[PDB]
């Protein structure tokens, strides 16, 4: 599923991401925009052989199992395929664990490089929430 901007904002808020660990909803929408362009089916291989999955490009090196990332962990206790669902529940639950890991949203390099410090409220501008 390819979400619209406000549609995703609404789903993320519904699933309790809004202000989770102090990160306003616009941060999460901005991260999703640059990680996946709002596409739940997005997958991208990393140079190290891990793969990133879903709207928030969660990495198989630490967080999900894809059966082909040697030496990795599965700290969200899910198959990475679960992270590609049209229903964002698995991605949200796993993102809550990631963002609680110590470095906040810096875990998402695109968030650090493209969202952090910017006017992230623009991402939820005009949305019925
Ligand atoms: Cl957009
Ligand atoms: Cl915001
Ligand atoms: Cl593996
Ligand atoms: Cl393969
Ligand atoms: Cl594990
Ligand atoms: Cl699995
Ligand atoms: Cl959903
Ligand atoms: Cl933080
Ligand atoms: Na893994």
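Sequence proposed for the structure above (129 residues):
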């Amino acid at each position: 599923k390819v979400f619209g901007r406000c549609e995703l904002a609404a789903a993320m808020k519904r699933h309790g991401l809004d202000n989770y660990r102090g990160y306003s909803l616009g941060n999460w929408v901005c991260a999703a925009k640059f990680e996946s362009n709002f596409n739940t089916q997005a997958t991208n291989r990393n140079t190290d052989g891990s793969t990133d999955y879903g709207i928030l490009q969660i990495n198989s090196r630490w967080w999900c199992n894809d059966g082909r990332t040697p030496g990795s962990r599965n700290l969200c206790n899910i198959p990475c395929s679960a992270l590609l669902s049209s229903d964002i529940t698995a991605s949200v639950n796993c993102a809550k664990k990631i963002v609680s890991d110590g470095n906040g949203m810096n875990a998402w390099v695109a968030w650090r490089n493209r969202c952090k410090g910017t006017d992230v409220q623009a991402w939820i501008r005009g949305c019925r929430l």
